[PDB]
Design a binder for these strands. Sequence first.
RNA 1: AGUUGGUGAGCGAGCUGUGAUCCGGGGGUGUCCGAAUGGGGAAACCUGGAAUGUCCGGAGUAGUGUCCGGUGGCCCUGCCCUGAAUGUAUAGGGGUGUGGGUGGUAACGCGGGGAAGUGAAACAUCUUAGUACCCGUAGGAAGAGAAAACAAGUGUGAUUCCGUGAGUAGUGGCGAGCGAAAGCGGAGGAGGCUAAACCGUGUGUGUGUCAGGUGUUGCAUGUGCGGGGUUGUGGGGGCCUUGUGGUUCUGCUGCCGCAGGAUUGGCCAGUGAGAAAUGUUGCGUGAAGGUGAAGCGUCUGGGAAGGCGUACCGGAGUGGGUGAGAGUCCUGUAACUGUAAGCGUGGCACUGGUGUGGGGUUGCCCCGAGUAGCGUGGGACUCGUGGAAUUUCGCGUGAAUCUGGCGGGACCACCCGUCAAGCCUAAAUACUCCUUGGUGACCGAUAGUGGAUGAGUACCGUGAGGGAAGGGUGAAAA
RNA 2: GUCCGAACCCACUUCAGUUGAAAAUGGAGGGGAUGAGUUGUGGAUAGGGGUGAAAGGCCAAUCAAACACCGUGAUAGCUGG
RNA 3: GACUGUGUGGUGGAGUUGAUGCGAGUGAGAAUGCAGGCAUGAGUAGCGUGUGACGGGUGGGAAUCCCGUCCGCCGAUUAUCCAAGGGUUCCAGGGUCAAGUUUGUCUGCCCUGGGUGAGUCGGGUCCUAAGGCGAGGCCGACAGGCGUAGUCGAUGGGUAACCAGUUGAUAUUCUGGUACCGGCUUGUCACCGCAAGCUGCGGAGGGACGCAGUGAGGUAGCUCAU
RNA 4: GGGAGCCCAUGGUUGUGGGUGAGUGAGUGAUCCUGUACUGUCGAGAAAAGCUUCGUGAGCGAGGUGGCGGGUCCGCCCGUA
Lengths: 95, 69, 60, 107
Amino acid sequence: ELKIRDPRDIILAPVVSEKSYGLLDQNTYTFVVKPTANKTEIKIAIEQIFGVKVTSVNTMNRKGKVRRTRTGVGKRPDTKRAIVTVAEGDRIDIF
Amino acid sequence: KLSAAELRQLSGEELRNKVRELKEELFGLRFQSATGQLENTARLREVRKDIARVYTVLQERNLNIVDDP
Amino acid sequence: AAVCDICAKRPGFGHNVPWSKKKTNRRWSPNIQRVRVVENGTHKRMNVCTSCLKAGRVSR
Amino acid sequence: MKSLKIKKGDRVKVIAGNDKGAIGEVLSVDPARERVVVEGVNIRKHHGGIISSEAPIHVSNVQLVTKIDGKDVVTRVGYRRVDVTKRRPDGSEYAAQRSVRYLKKEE
RNA sequence: AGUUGGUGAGCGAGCUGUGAUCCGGGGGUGUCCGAAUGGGGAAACCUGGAAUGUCCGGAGUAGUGUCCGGUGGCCCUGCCCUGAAUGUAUAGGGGUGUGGGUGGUAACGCGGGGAAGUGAAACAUCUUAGUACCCGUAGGAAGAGAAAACAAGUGUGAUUCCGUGAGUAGUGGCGAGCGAAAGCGGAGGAGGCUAAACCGUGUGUGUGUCAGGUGUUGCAUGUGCGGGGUUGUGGGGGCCUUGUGGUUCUGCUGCCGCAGGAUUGGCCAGUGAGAAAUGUUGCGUGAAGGUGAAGCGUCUGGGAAGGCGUACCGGAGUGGGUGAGAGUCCUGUAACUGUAAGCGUGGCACUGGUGUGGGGUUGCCCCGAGUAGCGUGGGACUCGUGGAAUUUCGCGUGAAUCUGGCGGGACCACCCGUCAAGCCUAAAUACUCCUUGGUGACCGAUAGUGGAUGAGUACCGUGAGGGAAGGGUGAAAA
RNA sequence: GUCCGAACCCACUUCAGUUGAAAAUGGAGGGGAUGAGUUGUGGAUAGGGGUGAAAGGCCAAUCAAACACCGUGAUAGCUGG
RNA sequence: GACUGUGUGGUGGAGUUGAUGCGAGUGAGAAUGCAGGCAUGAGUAGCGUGUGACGGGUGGGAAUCCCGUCCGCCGAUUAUCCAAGGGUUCCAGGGUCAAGUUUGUCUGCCCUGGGUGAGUCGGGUCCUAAGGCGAGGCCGACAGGCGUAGUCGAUGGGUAACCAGUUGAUAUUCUGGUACCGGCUUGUCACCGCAAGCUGCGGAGGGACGCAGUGAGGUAGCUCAU
RNA sequence: GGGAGCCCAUGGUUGUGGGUGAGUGAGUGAUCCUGUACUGUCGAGAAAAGCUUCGUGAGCGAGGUGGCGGGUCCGCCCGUA
Ligand SMILES: [Mg+2]
Ligand SMILES: [Mg+2]
Ligand SMILES: [Mg+2]
Ligand SMILES: [Mg+2]
Ligand SMILES: [Mg+2]
Ligand SMILES: [Mg+2]
Ligand SMILES: [Mg+2]
Ligand SMILES: [Mg+2]
Ligand SMILES: [Mg+2]
Ligand SMILES: [Mg+2]
Ligand SMILES: [Mg+2]
Ligand SMILES: [Mg+2]
Ligand SMILES: [Mg+2]
Ligand SMILES: [Mg+2]
Ligand SMILES: [Mg+2]
Ligand SMILES: [Mg+2]
Ligand SMILES: [Mg+2]
Ligand SMILES: [Mg+2]
Ligand SMILES: [Mg+2]
Ligand SMILES: [Mg+2]
Ligand SMILES: [Mg+2]
Ligand SMILES: [Mg+2]
Ligand SMILES: [Mg+2]
Ligand SMILES: [Mg+2]
Ligand SMILES: [Mg+2]
Ligand SMILES: [Mg+2]
Ligand SMILES: [Mg+2]
Ligand SMILES: [Mg+2]
Ligand SMILES: [Mg+2]
Ligand SMILES: [Mg+2]
Ligand SMILES: [Mg+2]
Ligand SMILES: [Mg+2]
Ligand SMILES: [Mg+2]
Ligand SMILES: [Mg+2]
Ligand SMILES: [Mg+2]
Ligand SMILES: [Mg+2]
Ligand SMILES: [Mg+2]
Ligand SMILES: [Mg+2]
Ligand SMILES: [Mg+2]
Ligand SMILES: [Mg+2]
Ligand SMILES: [Mg+2]
Ligand SMILES: [Mg+2]
Ligand SMILES: [Mg+2]
Ligand SMILES: [Mg+2]
Ligand SMILES: [Mg+2]
Ligand SMILES: [Mg+2]
Ligand SMILES: [Mg+2]
Ligand SMILES: [Mg+2]
Ligand SMILES: [Mg+2]
Ligand SMILES: [Mg+2]
Ligand SMILES: [Mg+2]
Ligand SMILES: [Mg+2]
Ligand SMILES: [Mg+2]
Ligand SMILES: [Mg+2]
Ligand SMILES: [Mg+2]
Ligand SMILES: [Mg+2]
Ligand SMILES: [Mg+2]
Ligand SMILES: [Mg+2]
Ligand SMILES: [Mg+2]
Ligand SMILES: [Mg+2]
Ligand SMILES: [Mg+2]
Ligand SMILES: [Mg+2]
Ligand SMILES: [Mg+2]
Ligand SMILES: [Mg+2]
Ligand SMILES: [Mg+2]
Ligand SMILES: [Mg+2]
Ligand SMILES: [Mg+2]
Ligand SMILES: [Mg+2]
Ligand SMILES: [Mg+2]
Ligand SMILES: [Mg+2]
Ligand SMILES: [Mg+2]
Ligand SMILES: [Mg+2]
Ligand SMILES: [Mg+2]
Ligand SMILES: [Mg+2]
Ligand SMILES: [Mg+2]
Ligand SMILES: [Mg+2]
Ligand SMILES: [Mg+2]
Ligand SMILES: [Mg+2]
Ligand SMILES: [Zn+2]
């Protein structure tokens, strides 16, 4: 079958913000993931990508903001973000 | 370089390795874009185009449009 | 029933026509009879019109 | 859609507008809306700072110019078909037919 | 030779001619929902495969959670097994996956159901109108169609459509209204199959059949398949006088004849409705393209296409652009050309595939049955039940079958026409959601589509549904 | 299906409001308040039909036959232009 | 006469005049006409229950913003937390055209960025009620009606976690401490064997049920305290 | 774990490290718990699963499973402002 599936298709981008950097103090990383991926799949993908033991994965769905402009209401895409908790010393480099 | 019809001179397993390497490069590019790096933005689309090309070659081989090496 | 399982005879539609000719819609149903049949080897009921029953197009 | 008869790098003469008779090189072509930029003709300000540079003018307001006998003469163009060979993306060869522009008033 | 869509620029690229963007054609990918189809569901969500090695294949983990792909909706139908109560057997059950279906669609088609407002100066018959709407169901068109026809004294010769006939003859609470046909003039122009006798081919069963022949030779019913046959001043079968395409030379009928036979003629006939449907070669092209003529000088002007002067092209002076009004600045136009490709398409050759009757004859045999008629209750025909033909539905009743049936406006006789109760048929006709080109004593932003802009949007309504308004700087953002 | 009385449900009187705070309310009192009570969620009944401890009541703020669209540019011996 | 000048300016920036024909969406003051713009009433009524005062700050601008102090108000609710419904209004920073019945430096407004973490909470993966749909099926000219086997459907049944702390914005979710439930796997002990077990399938038990009332034993809470 | 005012200091509408001190008794008392208890009563007050147990109208399944304490990892989707 065509279309090999890579674990990097699930993990889209890291979330960079004050809360994410504060969570880095707890070995916690916030990633924007594919909105159809469950916690187990995200955990396995993170493990395979980074060679890092993951203790916990917490996910939330975030609604996109709606703003009224010329041409009416626009709606930013919905996102799901996984909050991955890493083992005591493993560390993930997001650059 | 952006890959071309010389992908038809490769084998199935190394074409699949090319797919995996392209996916990993795209992963790195997306992370750089999120983190504020990646001045070279055109590569972020060209890597996806290359993935499309490799899948095109694989599917033509699988469907026997082009004889498989 | 008003439809024959053989020949598909179905009701007609026309008029009640009184002395004053004040026409009203009405129906003419076929004389459908429900009889026991043995087709090939199958025992079953069938709604059969009296015309087919008289012609013998139904096996009892 | 196809291209225009005037291409970048050509030497053309302005035949209409505030700069009739001006001769310059075609700096850039905008085929979609048929406007070209010729050096040292339509000097106006952009934006950014001042940027005193050339503004596009309509392609029909310029004409290819040739030097026949020491005087610049505006000329029209024609095309002739010449046998060429084109390479398919894989690199194979095949003989095909291509058009080449020539200036009139000089054969 | 530029290019990474638009509203709406500069980054970072590719093309830096290794020819991109772009254009035509053909593929690849195509999340989720939707007939939606593994199961469920509040459409775009959820959830799965009893226990076994796991539904099957792959990936991952020590292992389970997991991932990727495949598979199984329902109904009809084909094939195989089984056969209930129960005996035959069927229903049913278990396989197999053979085929088809589901839903959508602007108008036009066919079949069926079927209003009311309205008009009649009320109103019920009638009208509106078989309209609106609705149900079923197509096709590129459909329906109809090869005389159980018209005609009226000769004749016409399938159907459909157009013009007349004619607002006539008629019909009508003879009110309001409704309203033909023949004939004639045109568009377009085909006719073909079948059922039945009769002859070849099995099962509820032989004891009568010169080479041959046995209580049966091949004898009796009625099947499924072949021929044969298809018409009306009757035809066909049968019975015969002949005729099949030149034969290798097989059985039967009679050591006459009949049929299978085989490369080869072959009048022919063909992808059509025509009892059928399978490759190679000859044409112009549609989708893209290619070529495509011929002007300068001065004047005023921000700007020349305007003025003045003076030349040119024209199979091209239709347009539209360009800083103002351009035949020669641009796009094109005329004319010619290319089309590789198409599922290409149309036509031709070939290939390939399929194949005769005429005359006489009545003695017999066959010629479409719950049909045609008749009665009755309704419908359509100019015809509103009538002198009511013709045609149609429901319910009864129910024929002849050639010395016969039906039609010619009740009916009967004669005469003339025709042969129903089986089927298939192109063209002329209807239509435009769409595609391409073109047009307008058509509109020009309160118009023209509701909609020149985020328009079936904003907004209103629980919902079906309703439903707007807002265009213009300049030649160039300078 | 007792009594008094909050919540709750109701709506008898009065005043105010009546271009309202409100297309039916507010202030003051008033009836029921263990019952034929009241209330939440989901569901069922549909237009000559539903439902009605019955007032022609109610069925999405005007019901002696809802609303929407269609027949439709209904018709009007009437009124206006 | 409808109207008009081949008079003369201004504005304006691309068309259009006369003759003679031809064709009309060809003329408006009325329709409680339609659309838009704008008057009249009029700087008039109103500004939606109420208690604010002051000191300081910010600012171009302060009764109406911020801080503080007095004072007043609610408190079976003017408090706190859910469901339904809403949908980013939440937080931080920038803003004062519009919106806010005034002002506004302020906002539930605008702009930009950020914010919602669950094996246990509430739903699904479990269960059914009313009711819906419904393989076959029966009924009905067509369209359809009903319904079996089933399959859905909470407002009910079933179901394992608490306290503390932390952020500008989250918390039975994160963190700390200490638990519990179901799997997988593993160590060890004990036990089976027409006759292990597992999964299906059902039987039974159980789940499993009204209203009203009194009393008793407790605890939460509250009050007081030498 | 939580819980006040004392600290060179902090920083001056601020939080840090120490400084946390007490946990006792009586009264009163629920709409909560025992409790679907108990008593009274007519109007006679869901279903199904989970659950316990029983077999076997089905298959799987090896002589391997099923139990009791101990250890490791796995625990999904939606909501959460
Ligand atoms: Mg969550
Ligand atoms: Mg978007
Ligand atoms: Mg009628
Ligand atoms: Mg009888
Ligand atoms: Mg190419
Ligand atoms: Mg060219
Ligand atoms: Mg390309
Ligand atoms: Mg599905
Ligand atoms: Mg479904
Ligand atoms: Mg499927
Ligand atoms: Mg299994
Ligand atoms: Mg269909
Ligand atoms: Mg009537
Ligand atoms: Mg009338
Ligand atoms: Mg009248
Ligand atoms: Mg036809
Ligand atoms: Mg003929
Ligand atoms: Mg004719
Ligand atoms: Mg036959
Ligand atoms: Mg030219
Ligand atoms: Mg000129
Ligand atoms: Mg006949
Ligand atoms: Mg007759
Ligand atoms: Mg009759
Ligand atoms: Mg009639
Ligand atoms: Mg008759
Ligand atoms: Mg007669
Ligand atoms: Mg036909
Ligand atoms: Mg308009
Ligand atoms: Mg205008
Ligand atoms: Mg307007
Ligand atoms: Mg709405
Ligand atoms: Mg009482
Ligand atoms: Mg209340
Ligand atoms: Mg009252
Ligand atoms: Mg009053
Ligand atoms: Mg009382
Ligand atoms: Mg309902
Ligand atoms: Mg009354
Ligand atoms: Mg009402
Ligand atoms: Mg009525
Ligand atoms: Mg009408
Ligand atoms: Mg009128
Ligand atoms: Mg009047
Ligand atoms: Mg005129
Ligand atoms: Mg007018
Ligand atoms: Mg006016
Ligand atoms: Mg107005
Ligand atoms: Mg005024
Ligand atoms: Mg005053
Ligand atoms: Mg006044
Ligand atoms: Mg006053
Ligand atoms: Mg006042
Ligand atoms: Mg007030
Ligand atoms: Mg105030
Ligand atoms: Mg204050
Ligand atoms: Mg107080
Ligand atoms: Mg109190
Ligand atoms: Mg929410
Ligand atoms: Mg915001
Ligand atoms: Mg908002
Ligand atoms: Mg806020
Ligand atoms: Mg204001
Ligand atoms: Mg502010
Ligand atoms: Mg703010
Ligand atoms: Mg289930
Ligand atoms: Mg049920
Ligand atoms: Mg069914
Ligand atoms: Mg179930
Ligand atoms: Mg459920
Ligand atoms: Mg909060
Ligand atoms: Mg907490
Ligand atoms: Mg914790
Ligand atoms: Mg039980
Ligand atoms: Mg019970
Ligand atoms: Mg007590
Ligand atoms: Mg939350
Ligand atoms: Mg909250
Ligand atoms: Zn019948």
